[PDB]
Amino acid sequence: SHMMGSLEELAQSLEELAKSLKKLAWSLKKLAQGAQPLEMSLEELAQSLEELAKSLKKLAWSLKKLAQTKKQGDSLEELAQSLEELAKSLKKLAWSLKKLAQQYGDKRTSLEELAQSLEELAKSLKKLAWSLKKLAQVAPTQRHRYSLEELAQSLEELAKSLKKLAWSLKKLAQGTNDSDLKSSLEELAQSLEELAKSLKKLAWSLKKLAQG
């Protein structure tokens, strides 16, 4: 009911985020056309973003299968695997971002902090996957309400971390002036903010389910 709707809203927000990442990848490739140094690092960062976008669309499909359906346990484990794969792609993205930042001056610090934030996000997603694999081994009617409330809290903390990431990308955009890079960064920030909202709505559905 409300759970299926919250899971599908989240999958939709993940697919929109993937599209914003693909736009940013294109901006970075155009930046790599020779009008500024560090062509190779820009191209590598662009490729990592396209790989991140592919992992997000795989995660969205996993959520859609969960929303549509005794097979609940299997679907949760598939979801946890997709999260672990997304975490790996985030760590690779952070690695490429650090390499790019080595080429900048005043901007190097904000780019390095951004990469550190992605590394912390990856760690939080691995912990979420672990919690989901635990839940998957408990029959849905035997799950403790506190197990559901802890999951909702974890999603609310993830939303806060994405809003902080969005704020840092907005500040980066203000300092930029690319081609359409500024517009691609602002759009990405808005997609992360929408994702954070969809995570808060899912947390609400879990807290509602915990009360039942």
Author numbering: -3 to 65, 69 to 176, 178 to 212
Which lines from the publication concern this structure?
Here we describe efficient routes starting from validated parallel and antiparallel peptide assemblies to design two families of α-helical barrel proteins with central channels that bind small molecules. For targets with antiparallel helices, short loops are sufficient.
Using the experimental apCC-Hex structure as a seed, we designed short loop sequences computationally to connect adjacent helices to generate an up-down α-meander structure. The sequences and structures were named sc-apCC-6-LLIA and sc-apCC-6-SLLA, respectively, for single-chain antiparallel coiled-coil proteins with six central helices. As the peptide assemblies were hyperthermally stable, we heat treated the cell lysate (75 °C for 10 min) and subjected the soluble fraction to immobilized metal affinity chromatography (IMAC) and size exclusion chromatography (SEC) to yield highly pure proteins in a minimal number of steps. Moreover, DPH binding suggested that they had accessible hydrophobic channels. The outlier is sc-apCC-6-SLLA, in which the experimental structure and model differ at one of the Ser–Ser (g–g) helical interfaces. Thus, the success rate for making these single-chain constructs from the seven antiparallel designs test was five soluble proteins (71%) and two new α-helical barrel crystal structures (29%).
